[PDB]
Design a protein around this motif. Structure first.
Motif, PDB file in Angstrom:
ATOM      1  N   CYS A  73       0.833  -1.176   0.000  1.00  0.00           N
ATOM      2  CA  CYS A  73       0.000   0.000   0.000  1.00  0.00           C
ATOM      3  C   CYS A  73       0.881   1.244   0.000  1.00  0.00           C
ATOM      4  O   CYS A  73       1.644   1.482   0.941  1.00  0.00           O
ATOM      5  CB  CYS A  73      -0.900  -0.018   1.227  1.00  0.00           C
ATOM      6  N   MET A  88      -3.542   7.543   3.185  1.00  0.00           N
ATOM      7  CA  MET A  88      -3.538   6.278   2.482  1.00  0.00           C
ATOM      8  C   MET A  88      -4.725   6.209   1.546  1.00  0.00           C
ATOM      9  O   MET A  88      -5.832   6.629   1.890  1.00  0.00           O
ATOM     10  CB  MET A  88      -3.634   5.125   3.476  1.00  0.00           C
ATOM     11  N   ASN A 140      -2.942  -6.381   9.626  1.00  0.00           N
ATOM     12  CA  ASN A 140      -2.209  -5.349   8.907  1.00  0.00           C
ATOM     13  C   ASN A 140      -2.146  -5.578   7.405  1.00  0.00           C
ATOM     14  O   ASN A 140      -1.325  -4.982   6.722  1.00  0.00           O
ATOM     15  CB  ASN A 140      -0.785  -5.268   9.430  1.00  0.00           C
ATOM     16  N   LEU A 142      -4.536  -5.682   3.817  1.00  0.00           N
ATOM     17  CA  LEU A 142      -5.786  -5.093   3.366  1.00  0.00           C
ATOM     18  C   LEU A 142      -6.303  -5.717   2.085  1.00  0.00           C
ATOM     19  O   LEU A 142      -5.534  -6.244   1.281  1.00  0.00           O
ATOM     20  CB  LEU A 142      -5.608  -3.598   3.146  1.00  0.00           C
ATOM     21  N   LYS A 150      -2.990  -5.945  -0.294  1.00  0.00           N
ATOM     22  CA  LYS A 150      -1.835  -5.064  -0.235  1.00  0.00           C
ATOM     23  C   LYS A 150      -1.364  -5.018   1.202  1.00  0.00           C
ATOM     24  O   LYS A 150      -2.187  -5.049   2.100  1.00  0.00           O
ATOM     25  CB  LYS A 150      -2.235  -3.661  -0.689  1.00  0.00           C
ATOM     26  N   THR A 152      -0.154  -2.834   4.248  1.00  0.00           N
ATOM     27  CA  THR A 152      -0.288  -1.441   4.649  1.00  0.00           C
ATOM     28  C   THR A 152       0.818  -1.099   5.651  1.00  0.00           C
ATOM     29  O   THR A 152       1.562  -1.985   6.091  1.00  0.00           O
ATOM     30  CB  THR A 152      -1.647  -1.194   5.319  1.00  0.00           C
ATOM     31  N   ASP A 153       0.923   0.185   6.000  1.00  0.00           N
ATOM     32  CA  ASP A 153       1.890   0.644   6.993  1.00  0.00           C
ATOM     33  C   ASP A 153       1.235   1.445   8.110  1.00  0.00           C
ATOM     34  O   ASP A 153       0.067   1.789   8.032  1.00  0.00           O
ATOM     35  CB  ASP A 153       2.973   1.500   6.337  1.00  0.00           C
TER      36      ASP A 153
END
Lengths: 290, 30
Positions: A73, A88, A140, A142, A150, A152-153
């Motif tokens: 992401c 995001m 964590n 998605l 993906k 994410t962070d």
């Protein structure tokens, strides 16, 4: 590439869930008066970030803001004031952990396997970008579409200095049941400490959002792993699949698999799902006027 | 093509051991 944003370009509509590490709002952003809206997710981090902490969140966002891979992401824009804010691309289906937990019945073995690949792909990219995601887990990850996940962070990734392989986190709160052992005993995180969480996370999907080391206090995951206990074979898992996970939970970390390998294996098991994953009931699943 | 587990009416143990696999058991050592 890192867009630094004006507190008045995005309006954070509703709270979309919130931990005590951070809080995620949704989430609408419109660039400098530019036309109309693109719905974003606003992650705002919480605990008072030191001068060294911020450099770090910074460096990684410089990288996170420039990702080309489809399974990571990408950052839109960051928003420093007294608080951090990651912008995001909004993901509507959302936290994957919570997806499989309630689409349990209709999740095929084809999905499970691709998801694993995608993730292994996202994660592989992040390795080539000197990153050390330090926070990979099922919650964590998605869902764009049920056939596209993906990673994410949320700031916890760490960028690796060219001539380094290590990283020594400071202190604070850590997801202990997803961490390797050095990580746990040594606050050391590297790319293999990262594959270990790939382990837990794939176990996490094979058990359909089941809870890791359930019933056991974080207080000595340290020792259970030190005695030699790992996560149990998931029921849907032929030996082949499952000792790929149990490879990722080895003590010595240089000899855990590499995401580059991890990609091939799951990618082959992927073009032949039911041969490795057995899921009972798989083959089905003004103007106008009066 | 099917070497699944044997679990009794399904349930899963909190953890499964791999001891004394030196590759998994950790030389404490103490």
């Amino acid at each position: 590439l890192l867009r630094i944003l004006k507190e008045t370009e995005f309006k954070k509509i509703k709270v979309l869930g919130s931990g005590a590490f951070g809080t995620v709002y949704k989430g609408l952003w419109i660039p400098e008066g530019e036309k109309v809206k693109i719905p974003v997710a606003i992650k705002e981090l919480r605990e008072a970030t030191s001068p060294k902490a911020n450099k770090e969140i910074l460096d990684e966002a410089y990288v996170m803001a420039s990702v080309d891979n489809p399974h990571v992401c990408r950052l839109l824009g960051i928003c420093l004031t007294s608080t951090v804010q990651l912008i995001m691309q909004l993901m509507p289906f959302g936290c994957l952990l919570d997806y499989v937990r309630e689409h349990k019945d209709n999740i095929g073995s084809q999905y499970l396997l691709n998801w694993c690949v995608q993730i292994a792909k996202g994660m592989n990219y992040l390795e080539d970008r000197r990153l050390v995601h330090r926070d990979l887990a099922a919650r964590n990850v998605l869902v764009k579409t049920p056939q596209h996940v993906k990673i994410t962070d949320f700031g916890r990734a760490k960028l690796l200095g060219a001539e380094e392989k290590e990283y020594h986190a400071e202190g604070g709160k850590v997801p202990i049941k997803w961490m390797a052992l050095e990580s746990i005993l040594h606050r050391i995180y590297t790319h293999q400490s990262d594959v270990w969480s790939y382990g837990v996370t794939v176990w996490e999907l094979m058990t359909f959002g089941s809870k890791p080391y359930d019933g056991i206090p974080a207080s000595e995951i340290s020792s259970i792993l030190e005695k030699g206990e790992r996560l149990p074979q998931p029921p849907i898992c032929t030996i082949d699949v499952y000792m790929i996970m149990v490879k990722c939970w080895m003590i010595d970390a240089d000899s855990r698999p590499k995401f580059r390998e991890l990609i091939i294996e799951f990618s082959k098991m992927a073009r032949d799902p039911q041969r490795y994953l057995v899921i009972q009931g798989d083959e089905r699943m003004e103007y106008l006027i009066p | 093509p099917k070497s699944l587990p044997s679990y009794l009416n399904g349930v899963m143990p909190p953890t499964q051991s791999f001891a004394p696999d030196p590759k998994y058991v950790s030389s404490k050592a103490l």
